[PDB]
Ligand binder design. Structure first.
Ligand code: HEM
Ligand SMILES: CC1=C[C@@]23[C@H](C=C(C(=O)O)[C@@H]2COC(=O)[C@]32CO2)[C@@H]1C
Length: 397
């Protein structure tokens, strides 16, 4: 008897840690240690999906003495309206109600055209440069930050100011750095809201200023813009880096994609499903039980912490036959859980798919000989950041 302790070791730079797979074959739910409180870890797809849709399972902590968390996690939960369990129902409903209409078909179609031109321009630059080139810096980071600038209605150069603020806000290793970084986001957002009040445009804060005939406080609006800035680019960057690495590992599928860019949507769903980095700590959705729940034969009691392993679930043979294999031809793939599910289902997920699709429509058709310029083993997943990610992807082509 040995209590498994998160995070588990991963000898590979991607995938699911061996011990996590071992637990998943044993059963759907396991008691594990973590950096703080012990938690139920749910590993199989069926149970993860069902509990993500169970409203007794909430982001907010209902416990009388909530355990102290990193500043990073505290900011993340606060941005998701999860910091006060008594107000979370009304606050979270308002948050989704105000943000979902910002991702309208009209905005997404215009965004798609611009995204497509931007990738073409990014790849022409990449192709004109001399190897070795950091693909992370000149492609992965640049497209999603471009998109956030357009969402917020600010010049592209602004991403040179804010492009590391998600990383800094979500650094679990340094509470002081986390708070200084978030203070910069807050300052920047408030200045931006004040300007959109007198110089609006076709962007999301202008629409929020106009919403509820302006009943929303500037702080309400800046809060929603902080969620857009801080969630709107970093994960997409990481998925671009991860998707490149997966397609380099699977040359048969990659060549198919280069030949037929109509396979890009399929590739993108496989990228999202299999794209798990390092120890995959960001592929765990955290929740607390607000009521008793029976899972398998395990009783989750009110107040317990629950780790919902969407990465492990996405690899689950029960849902995806040979779940570890990259396959563009998965007939009618069970919807992966990489955007979550249920009440907090990712709000930017159509935008992210549009971005990823534009990228992988073009990348290996524009640079078919693109390959890693360093061994895979030299790529370092940043475990201390809630959002993880690699810091550089050296490539030749
Ligand atoms: C490939 C890129 C992305 C991935 C893998 C991803 C993943 C996720 C996941 C798993 C959740 C659920 C978290 C939970 O249930 O606790 C979530 C929530 C969220 N995401 Fe995405 N996301 C991505 C891109 C984006 C983009 C581009 C935006 C906005 C521009 C965005 C905005 C949000 C917001 C606001 C939430 C909170 C939803 C809520 O709590 O109600 N994300 N994301
Ligand atoms: C607001 C979010 C938190 C994430 C979710 C995806 C993430 C990621 O891919 O890094 C984050 C990591 O931390 C979490 O708790 C998540 C998984 O729930 C999403 C962007």
């Amino acid at each position: 008897t040995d209590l498994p302790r998160l995070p588990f070791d991963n000898p590979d730079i991607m995938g699911i840690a061996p011990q996590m797979l071992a637990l998943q074959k044993e059963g759907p739910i396991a008691r594990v240690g973590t950096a703080g409180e012990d938690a139920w870890l749910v590993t199989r797809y069926d149970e993860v999906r069902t509990l993500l849709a169970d409203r007794r399972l909430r982001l907010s902590n209902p416990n009388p003495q909530p355990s102290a968390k990193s500043a990073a996690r505290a900011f993340m939960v606060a941005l998701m309206a999860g910091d006060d369990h008594e107000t979370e129902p009304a606050r979270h409903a308002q948050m989704r109600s105000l943000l979902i209409p910002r991702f309208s078909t009209r905005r997404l179609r215009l965004m798609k055209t611009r995204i497509e031109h931007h990738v073409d321009e990014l790849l022409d630059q990449l192709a004109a440069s001399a190897p070795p080139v950091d693909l992370h810096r000149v492609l992965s980071f640049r497209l999603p930050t471009m998109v956030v600038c357009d969402l917020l209605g600010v010049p592209l150069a602004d991403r040179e100011r804010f492009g590391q603020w998600a990383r800094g806000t979500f650094d679990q290793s340094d509470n002081e750095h986390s708070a200084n970084t978030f203070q910069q986001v807050v300052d920047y957002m408030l200045e931006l809201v004040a300007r959109k009040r007198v110089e609006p445009g076709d962007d999301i804060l202008s629409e929020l200023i106009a919403e509820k005939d302006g009943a929303l406080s500037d702080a309400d609006i800046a809060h929603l813009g902080n969620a857009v800035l801080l969630f709107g680019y970093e994960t997409t960057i990481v998925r671009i880096d991860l998707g490149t690495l997966l397609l380099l590992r699977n040359p048969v599928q990659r060549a198919q994609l280069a030949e037929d860019p109509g396979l890009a949507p399929a590739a993108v769903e496989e990228i999202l499903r299999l794209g798990v980095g390092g120890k995959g700590s960001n592929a765990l959705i955290p929740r607390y039980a607000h009521g008793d729940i029976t899972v398998g034969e395990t009783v989750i009691r009110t107040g317990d912490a629950v780790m919902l392993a969407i990465g492990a679930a996405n690899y689950d043979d029960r849902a995806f036959p040979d779940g570890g294999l990259f396959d563009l031809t998965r007939v009618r793939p069970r919807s992966h859980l990489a955007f979550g599910h249920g009440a907090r289902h990712c709000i930017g997920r159509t935008l992210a798919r549009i971005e990823l699709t534009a990228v992988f429509e073009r990348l290996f058709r524009r640079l078919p000989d693109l390959r890693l310029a360093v061994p895979e083993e030299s790529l370092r997943w940043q475990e201390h950041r809630i959002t993880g990610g690699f810091d550089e992807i050296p490539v030749t082509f």
